[PDB]
Amino acid sequence: KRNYILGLAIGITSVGYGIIDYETRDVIDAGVRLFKEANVENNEGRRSKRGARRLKRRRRHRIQRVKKLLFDYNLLTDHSELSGINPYEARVKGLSQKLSEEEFSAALLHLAKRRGVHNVNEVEEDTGNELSTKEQISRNSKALEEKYVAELQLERLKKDGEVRGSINRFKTSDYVKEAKQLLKVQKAYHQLDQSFIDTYIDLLETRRTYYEGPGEGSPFGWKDIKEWYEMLMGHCTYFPEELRSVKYAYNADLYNALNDLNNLVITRDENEKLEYYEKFQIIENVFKQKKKPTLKQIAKEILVNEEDIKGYRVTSTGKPEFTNLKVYHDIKDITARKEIIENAELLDQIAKILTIYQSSEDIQEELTNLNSELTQEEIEQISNLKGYTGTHNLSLKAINLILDELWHTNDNQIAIFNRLKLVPKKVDLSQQKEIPTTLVDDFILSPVVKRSFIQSIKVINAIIKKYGLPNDIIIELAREKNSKDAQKMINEMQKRNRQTNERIEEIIRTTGKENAKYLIEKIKLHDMQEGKCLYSLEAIPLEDLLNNPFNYEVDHIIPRSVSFDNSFNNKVLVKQEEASKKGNRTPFQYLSSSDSKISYETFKKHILNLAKGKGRISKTKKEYLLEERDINRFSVQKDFINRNLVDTRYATRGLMNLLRSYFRVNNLDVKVKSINGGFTSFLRRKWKFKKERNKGYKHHAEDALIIANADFIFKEWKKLDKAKKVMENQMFEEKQAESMPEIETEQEYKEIFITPHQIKHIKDFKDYKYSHRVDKKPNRELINDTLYSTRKDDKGNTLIVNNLNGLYDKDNDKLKKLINKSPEKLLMYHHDPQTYQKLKLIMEQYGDEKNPLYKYYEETGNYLTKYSKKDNGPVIKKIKYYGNKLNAHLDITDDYPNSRNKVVKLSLKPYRFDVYLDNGVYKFVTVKNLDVIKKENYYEVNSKCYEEAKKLKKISNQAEFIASFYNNDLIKINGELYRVIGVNNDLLNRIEVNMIDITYREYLENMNDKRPPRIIKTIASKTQSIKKYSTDILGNLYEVKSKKHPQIIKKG
RNA sequence: GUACCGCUCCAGUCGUUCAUGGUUUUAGUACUCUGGAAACAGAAUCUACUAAAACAAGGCAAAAUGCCGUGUUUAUCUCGUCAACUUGUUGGCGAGAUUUUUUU
DNA sequence: AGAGTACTAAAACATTCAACATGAACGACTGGAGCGGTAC
DNA sequence: TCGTTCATGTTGAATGTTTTAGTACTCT
Ligand SMILES: [Mg+2]
Ligand SMILES: [Mg+2]
Ligand SMILES: [Mg+2]
């Protein structure tokens, strides 16, 4: 062990470490660890698929009920035709006349698949003909107005023809009504007498509520109802063993009232604050009697001036009004009976019950369970109170230990808790050696920063074990990046003084009011965009946004599928007339179109004048508003990831206090500080590094080691005294602060914060150590979901049949690739030649356009017609056509019966592989992600597929095992070291891998090359030396000589 | 400045609760072709729109208002460090075997 | 013996082509922001 | 922004073409 100081950096991709000597400021270690980058969309998807899982699992339950009761009353059997009966006619012809067994079964099954929305039971409004479900249910109701959904559906069938899509969202109770209609019609047609009418709708109205929870086995739920009504909330602060209590508990409201009474200001010739008798008269004459105690009605009990009482809290309206004894009146306004309202404890219990539930029937039972003096008559009324949810941060037994004396003295709350020697949550670990992971859970916001943080504990404990205890820790974060840059943007403004600074400050500092944290982005974008729409540059006044909302709409910039950003960076304010026509179109493509008000260049200069001054657009948002390359692909869908930013303050302080507690208990006078990225931005600015981004994973270290020296900067100059106090949060002596030096202006930064002799070891360091996370977890993303179909032809190969949908669009240019390249592929090239000629007419008459079909629509007002005798065919939007011969796939024709030709999924995902050495040739075996079996709490690599993956490679029994490789290992291949990405192709023995020192894309732009950045290598007899090297938690290099292929999978 | 209360609103997360849709196969009717003089017959087989009926390989539990599959090991292999699962393996601790050569 | 011809079988360097989707509602927690204030 | 000053960009599978060696004939 030697004396060392640590410097950490963290980002949603990686962790970066820099270890410097404490004595002579010499760096000893510098490197970066990588791990599987996490985004909220990941766990959100794991949600959404679980959601859909239950959706299907109950859709099948709704199948089960109808199935069994069809079997029951002699209605259905496994001998009759099930397909070919139209339910649209079924449910309407069931309005008056007979329905057959199988037809009735079809109608009932269809109305079981369909249930409609509950949370809009009683919507009555007009419609703007948008895509939302409320307005469409409004249309459905206004179109029925006497009829049932059956009639509208069947009419839209017989007349127009298309009968699904966005226009089948209907009010649920309408389905319920037509359910009664058809059930009672079929009542007197078969062996159905009384029971059959009920149980369906009873079951067809079943639903799980947003608080029933998932099933029993849930690793996220609860075994009992009342359990999570004791788990969701927090605990007491000063008594971290007993639960909190509700926001509107009666004695809690007494607490708040006494707070507002014991903080008052009186300018009379007596005691400054109220006496005990004065307060008691107040509580029994004003608060208990009137809902909102008016200041005009409070002075009459103490005989003081009506307008000399101050020092209290206000109500929601922003007017001075005291904390209402909300439950007291509300029970009084319906119950004057005195046996209960004179009991504080049962009233507290009533408040707690009213809060910790929201059901209108559970509160009834839980009030009957309070064995009070009430009757049914009152409880049926009291159970329907509203607005009494929310918990308050203390408990009963912290209120009691302060209530009694609060009667008497005139102090203010927390002081009493200090007199009784009550201390908030402070963890003790004075007996431990390394930093634990037990204290993590309380200090966590979301899984993203959870992953980004929890491994700093692992790395620092490893550094302690290998290095002893350090002397200082300095930490930079991924969420502390715009403190001081924004502060100087607020304060510096312009040097011209006077006219410039005294006018636009109302937009620079936003008038210096708290309104900035109440307007939200829907009004912030008005300030951000000069009060002008981005896509039109028309006026968007602040008074019109607050008095005419309907003129302008707030929406995102880029769809989630290629942006995944739900923050204040990916949203804009656009006039309703333009926003309604947007959808899947950004400013680049939207404003360059044939009916746009402006060009891309005028908008570009608009953004530039919005992004070249005070309050400029952030480069992350600037790239959103200019578009790069093309949005219609996946290449930008990944490049939009690594520029994004978020701001938070809880996540920093969580681990900050976690480190301080542990370092204070074990008697470790170790400085621990976190720096915002604002200061380090200036540091990187003024330290004169090379003008290049082709550095890769080393950035995270080269930046982090910056921080590792920044702390030492605090011990070289004497202008940092106030800066030292601020970065340590040190209290300023009242007669000292005005002369304490801090660094705020650029001249001070250049005189003080520039150390060229202490940065030659950070900029020029090129000896990093890398190590990647072996994501050995089983059960990950196996295989994609877009099923694919396959046909047979003359040669005898199987062919993927691709599909082309949405022919009507103006901007679908893909069709040129069929006729003008090779029309042989299309199926209608061989079959239906007459329709082929029909198509060929349009194809040839518009051979010099973008989309010949949209040209046809312009020139004839109607799209192409399905070819037939009379040429009056439905519009064409979809085309099947021939694709590729298929070798490496997943034969999945097992599930569909009767398939005249096989069906395949696509794009298997490799998990690991295995090198073997037969005499002088290395051969591969691949363990896919499909090669895992679940047993109890562990996962076994099914060796059958494994040994079938070595025989088919023709691997000798005498072949010499080298290593099994997991993801992102270090493979020694004949001239280099590489990271497993995966086995690109097993049959070809083509494998895809990547560089270690830098991103190989970024390596290509290091050479400015043009081939795809895929390190793909084919394995054959030409192999000479394949070995395993590996790296430790810091990233240092070694080799492993393990003897056997890993067979068992470690969990955890 | 931190912990501290109560009000108000806002955002996010977790976690839960939904409806509508999307992709591939039979009966189709608008289809393709054959035979046939055509009639007509069948068989195919491109576009559509409905009946039906399945969506990460699996594991379960077995009719129950059922769940998990994009959350952690940790650099691998030795050495022991003893104890509990008990064929093993676990659980930890530490040192090595591993990163410049002279070295007590 | 040594190489062009002509083909033939096979292996590297690169190209091209696919990815399941909307509208809602609510408990907690968390934090954010405005109101005042006591200890430490 | 006179300024490298919040800071990079997929995973799999199937083709097209390009590169070379081998073989046998035939030429010298
Ligand atoms: Mg940073
Ligand atoms: Mg929209
Ligand atoms: Mg960085």
Numbering used by the authors: 2 to 1053
Manuscript excerpt for this entry:
The CRISPR-Cas9 system has been emerging as a simple and powerful genome editing technology and is widely applied to the fields of gene therapy, drug screening, disease model construction, etc.. This system mainly consists of two components: Cas9 endonuclease and single-guide RNA (sgRNA). Additionally, its DNA editing process is roughly as follows: firstly, Cas9 binds to sgRNA to form a ribonucleoprotein (RNP) complex; next, the RNP searches for the protospacer-adjacent motif (PAM) on DNA to locate the target site; meanwhile, ~20 nt guide sequence of the sgRNA tries to pair with the DNA sequences upstream of the PAM; once they are in a form of base pairing, Cas9 endonuclease is activated and then precisely cleaves the target site.
To promote the stable binding of the protein to DNA, we mutated D10 and N580 of the wild-type SaCas9 (wtSaCas9) into alanine and obtained dead SaCas9 (dSaCas9). In this study, we report the first cryo-electron microscopy (cryo-EM) map of the SaCas9-sgRNA-DNA ternary complex. This map reveals that the HNH nuclease domain is tightly bound to the cleavage site of the target DNA strand and closely interacts with the WED and REC domains. Hence, most parts of the SaCas9-sgRNA-DNA complex are distributed in the high-resolution regions of the map, except for the HNH domain, L1/L2 linkers, and a small part of RuvC3 (aa 717–755). The components of the complex model are SaCas9 (aa 2-1053; D10A/N580A), 104 nt sgRNA, 40 nt target DNA strand, and 28 nt non-target DNA strand. In addition, the model shows that the cryo-EM density contacts of the HNH domain with the REC and WED domains are attributed to the hydrogen bonding between the domains: S581 of the HNH domain with E131 of the REC domain, and S595 and R586 of the HNH domain with K811 and D812 of the WED domain, respectively. The model shows that the non-target DNA strand fragment of the PAM upstream stably inserts into the positively charged groove formed by the HNH, L2, RuvC, and PI domains. In addition, we observed that the double helix in the downstream of PAM is also embedded in the positively charged groove of the PI domain, and the phosphate backbone of dA15 in the target DNA strand binds to K1023 with a hydrogen bond.
